[PDB]
Amino acid sequence: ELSQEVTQTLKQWRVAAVSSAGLKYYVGVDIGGTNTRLALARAEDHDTFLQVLKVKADDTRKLIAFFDSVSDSIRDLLGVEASGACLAGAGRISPDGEVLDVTNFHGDATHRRLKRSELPSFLFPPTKTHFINDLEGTCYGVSSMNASDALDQCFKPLWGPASSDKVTLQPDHYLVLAVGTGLGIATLLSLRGGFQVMPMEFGHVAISPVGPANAAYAEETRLLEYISEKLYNKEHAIEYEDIVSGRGLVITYKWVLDEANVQDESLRSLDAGKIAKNATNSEACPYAHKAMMLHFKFLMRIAKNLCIGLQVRGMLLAGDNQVNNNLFLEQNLESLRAEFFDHPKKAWIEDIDLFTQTKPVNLNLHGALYVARG
Amino acid sequence: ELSQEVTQTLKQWRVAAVSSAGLKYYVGVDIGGTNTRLALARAEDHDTFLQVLKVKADDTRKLIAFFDSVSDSIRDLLGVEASGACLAGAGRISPDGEVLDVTNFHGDATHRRLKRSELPSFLFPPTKTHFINDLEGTCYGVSSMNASDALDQCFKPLWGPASSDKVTLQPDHYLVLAVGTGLGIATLLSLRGGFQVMPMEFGHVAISPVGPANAAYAEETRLLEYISEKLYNKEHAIEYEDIVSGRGLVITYKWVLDEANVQDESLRSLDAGKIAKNATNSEACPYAHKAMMLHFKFLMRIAKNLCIGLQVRGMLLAGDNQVNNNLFLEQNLESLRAEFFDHPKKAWIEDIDLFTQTKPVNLNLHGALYVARG
Ligand SMILES: OC[C@H]1O[C@@H](O)[C@H](O)[C@@H](O)[C@@H]1O
Ligand SMILES: OC[C@H]1O[C@@H](O)[C@H](O)[C@@H](O)[C@@H]1O
Ligand SMILES: [Ca+2]
Ligand SMILES: [Ca+2]
Ligand SMILES: [Ca+2]
Ligand SMILES: [Ca+2]
Ligand SMILES: [Ca+2]
Ligand SMILES: [Ca+2]
């Protein structure tokens, strides 16, 4: 079952199949840890696309059923096969490009892994289908929009030497981060004509502490030990993603509530989104604020250290979820900056630009559709 | 004052100046945090070079006097200007490539920074002189030796799926680390024909703790607080380089001695090299061993997390100092592996290759001489 807008649109598209140019269109997929989205774009649609379906899926067998279903649906409306496909997924891709491993899907290896050869040929031509990482897809989307001087349509400066200027990327490196089901991290590279994308897995590196004289030192130690207990039985130091994610905000929230002996089962049951919204009212939901503060504090800490290690010129906070959290970010700007410049080498990152996405736009789908064209 | 071997060699070289091909030679420089080395290679010397001078220097004004001096000395023996130069230095390089900032030199900005335009024209042709980072130079050296199938002449596998094979680099990413005056880190990249080098500053990122149930958790906290006290007055979390370096091994050693109330001023005064040598006798110098253990433990911890974040296929422990520490590494292999695979995502790094440099060879100079040729 497809929507009216999609149905009417595909009817307009298919008249071109009996034209000289034919109907050449491409498939793009954003496989997130919680939701998957699929979109189509014709050869001439250069900055736009048609989202045909989204689904809540946390294993690959359910994706296969979604792909089969939506493939048959588009086939009944277009007739003509897709000319190329790219799936940007929230995990790692095998050296041969054949297999995606979705890091935060649940179950055994079969339910976390997705092979190209399992995909329906209609939407996923066997020789013209590629896997990329989701943040790798974000970078191609960003690079594509930077090339057509359009990044200012969905990004805004939060600080840095370029913050009075319209958003545009210089030929240096830029770090891209996205907070969602997981912590996504990639880098736009300018080494040696264009931007090269490097996919990364830095959301899973062990966290760093604060200085022993920091006022948050005792309480951060308790939070890290609490999370390390619940996830790893204290055997490992937690990953940044164990805090900087949806479930991470939820578990930090439960820690804030345990230290305050707040037994209220209603405030106890909120999901990441309600905690995050509640946090924009500092005086009326102080516990949501405290958890969100620590959530974004650790996002600033991993971003700080990657800026130093990668020697980037700027960084971009991306994702549609980030749009809803920019208000919290501005309400707590000093607290975030205090964290970001808390480093012996703070002089090195004083001139780092920070951009944040301000309008909902699925940069992953744009990136996947850029790759799918070849 | 140049040596006999260098003097005799340059006399042999200069006969070619009155030949059809002329005398085209290139300058390479390895500017370390403690020592600087300079070398020459002719156009046809593809895997060899002539080291003409090394000096102990910890500020750039002393380097300028060394460069001026050795430039005039080579000029009096060769007559003909150098055709190209590259300086691989232990720090950052400005966007315009004009200025090197040596991270661990002492003094004000003038004594830590070195401009191209301050270099003698004879050895450093104004339009044909380039700055690279020292580990960036290491990678070009490694890549150069991999291209001529020669890495097995100075690297040996310590573990991984390729450890029965002769050392050769696949077309994937490789992390390169070197422990010396500082912690040097760069990455050989295979994105998209060849290896691309990415320079990095990851030695300066904040450390990670162990899991709260680890037997070393209480004592690591004391060590981190001790170093954070002495370097930063507890205001910052220490950098990996604050432990994984010469001065880091020395300060860890002093901490081991303080916790044992060892007042002996003779054992108290050892420099990094004597501590490291003493450490290869576990039963006779147990304190040196304990400090060296923690030294290499934190090297394994930063390497573990960078392998995860960068998704490399292998890593190389490089530098001439590493040669003298491989014995310690093999005596304490289980302790190092216990640290390296201590991660929730340990399955991801199970198949990572580890190589370590086994013969002294200045890979920085090879790399700089590769760049100097254009
Ligand atoms: O989706 C955000 C990120 O989530 C992480 O848990 C995955 O390992 C990454 O591959 C992904 O980019
Ligand atoms: O020499 C090893 C490393 O030392 C560090 O302190 C510097 O910041 C790096 O640029 C250098 O590569
Ligand atoms: Ca077909
Ligand atoms: Ca640049
Ligand atoms: Ca327990
Ligand atoms: Ca000249
Ligand atoms: Ca490859
Ligand atoms: Ca103090």
Would you give an account of this structure?
- The structure is a homodimer of 374-residue chains.
- Chain A has 374 residues and is an alpha/beta fold.
- Chain A folds into 2 domains: 1-149 and 362-374, no CATH class; 150-361, no CATH class.
- Chain A contains 12 helices and 14 strands.
- The first copy, chain A, has helices spanning 4-13, 60-78, 109-112, 134-147, 217-232, 246-259, 272-278, 286-310, 320-331, 333-340, 346-349, 363-372, and strands at residues 25-31, 35-42, 50-56, 84-89, 91-93, 99-102, 113-115, 129-133, 155-159, 174-179, 183-189, 196-199, 314-318, 353-357.
- In chain A, β5 (91-93) and β6 form a beta hairpin.
- In chain A, α8 (286-310) packs parallel to α10 (333-340).
- Chains A and B meet through β12, α5 and α8 of A and β12, α5 and α8 of B.
- One calcium ion is lined by residues 171-172, 190 of chain A.
Short note summarizing the structure:
With 374 residues, chain A is of the alpha/beta class.
**What overall form of chain A do the CA principal axes indicate?**
globular
Tally of contiguous helical segments of chain A = 12
Q: What is the strand content of chain A? A: 15-25%
Radius of gyration of chain A: 22 Å
State the distance separating the first and last CA atoms of chain A: 30 Å
Helix content of chain A: 25-40%
For the biggest β-sheet of chain A, the strand order reads: 9-14-13-10-11-12
Give the oligomeric state: homodimer
Largest interface: A-B, 49 and 49 residues
H/E element sequence of chain A = HEEEHEEEHEEHEEEEHHHHEHHHEH
PDB class: transferase
Keywords: ssgcid, Glucokinase, Balamuthia mandrillaris Lepto ID, Structural Genomics, Seattle Structural Genomics Center for Infectious Disease, transferase
Assembly: dimeric
Entry title: Crystal structure of glucokinase from Balamuthia mandrillaris in complex with glucose
